[PDB]
């Protein structure tokens, strides 16, 4: 039940809050979003009406401070800021609420969608991928490249996802070339899980974050990363049972949430066909395969 107030809405804009969105008119008396569920990260995002290339947003967690949005007419965007004066913030918010100038984060208690999409996503992990230590929230936009993309392969303006490369020395032990290329279990279990992520929760958290950045911003590097992380699991002959079961749930909710219209831009045909139909784990993703076949049959 936290609140992100807006100073004002000087330019016409579509505002997203998690999987929801609504349009705001130029100079409409809009002063923010209230009733934001505590306990999850959230993302507030924007697409300007006069320029759809302006597509950007902020990941935040209200447990970490009082945040608000204010338009900057010099830089031409809605910026998140933290208000350090608690008393000043609660008074602004109270006044905006009393005047009913805020949108409510839509309830419907039966719906666990947002939890299911962000189950493993943690603000401290987000802040290691998006590096701007002076703020508690993280800016992402549709054009930011990933550290892996950069070349062939402002610091805060790149997404520092974990590099996955199937044809790298990291992925392939000397003397196990064929084994390791054909069965990625070493790369998944020893290199990625034990070595870099430390655990499957952190791995899934980055996977979930990558999907959400791809979906909400159309960020191409994030879509690459999401697909890479799925393929690495499906291409491993040996994966702990609890991870495969969790992966099925994770992908199910992601595919469920995707706009059927953006199916063609957000889903990689080669990767999905391999994962669902050819891979070691082709029979381990029952729910995901069932929703894909029924929602996007023209893809497979």
């Amino acid at each position: 039940m936290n609140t992100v107030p807006f100073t004002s809405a000087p330019i016409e804009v579509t505002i997203g809050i998690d999987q929801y969105s609504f349009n705001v008119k130029e100079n409409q008396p809009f002063h923010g979003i209230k009733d934001i569920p505590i306990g999850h990260v959230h993302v507030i995002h924007f697409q300007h009406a006069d320029n759809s290339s302006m597509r950007y947003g902020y990941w935040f967690d209200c447990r970490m401070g009082n945040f608000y949005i204010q338009y900057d007419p010099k830089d031409g965007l809605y910026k998140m800021m933290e208000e350090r004066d608690g008393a000043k913030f609660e008074n602004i918010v109270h006044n905006f609420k009393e005047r009913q100038m805020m949108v409510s984060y839509p309830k419907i208690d039966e719906d666990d969608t947002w939890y299911n999409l962000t189950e493993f996503v943690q603000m401290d992990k987000i802040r290691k991928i998006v590096r701007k230590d002076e703020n508690q929230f993280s800016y992402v936009d549709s054009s930011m490249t990933t550290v892996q993309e950069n070349e062939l392969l402002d610091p805060a303006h790149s997404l520092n996802y974990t590099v996955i490369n199937f044809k790298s020395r990291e992925a392939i032990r000397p003397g196990h070339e064929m084994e390791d290329f054909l069965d990625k279990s070493y790369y998944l279990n020893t290199v990625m899980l034990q070595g870099i992520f430390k655990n499957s929760s952190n791995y899934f958290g980055e996977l979930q974050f990558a999907f959400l950045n791809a979906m909400f911003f159309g960020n191409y590097g994030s879509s690459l990363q999401w697909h890479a992380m799925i393929e690495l699991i499906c291409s491993s002959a040996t994966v702990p049972k609890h991870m495969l079961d969790k992966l099925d749930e994770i992908l199910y909710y992601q595919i469920k949430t995707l706009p059927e219209q953006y199916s063609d831009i957000l889903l990689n045909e080669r990767v999905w066909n391999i994962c669902l139909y050819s891979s070691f784990q082709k029979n381990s993703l029952h729910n995901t395969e069932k929703i894909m076949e029924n929602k996007y049959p023209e893809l497979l």
Partner: peptide, 10 residues
């Protein structure tokens, strides 16, 4: 191509 690329990573 793949088998040789992988064996020639060095």
């Amino acid at each position: 191509l793949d088998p040789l690329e992988v064996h020639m990573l060095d």
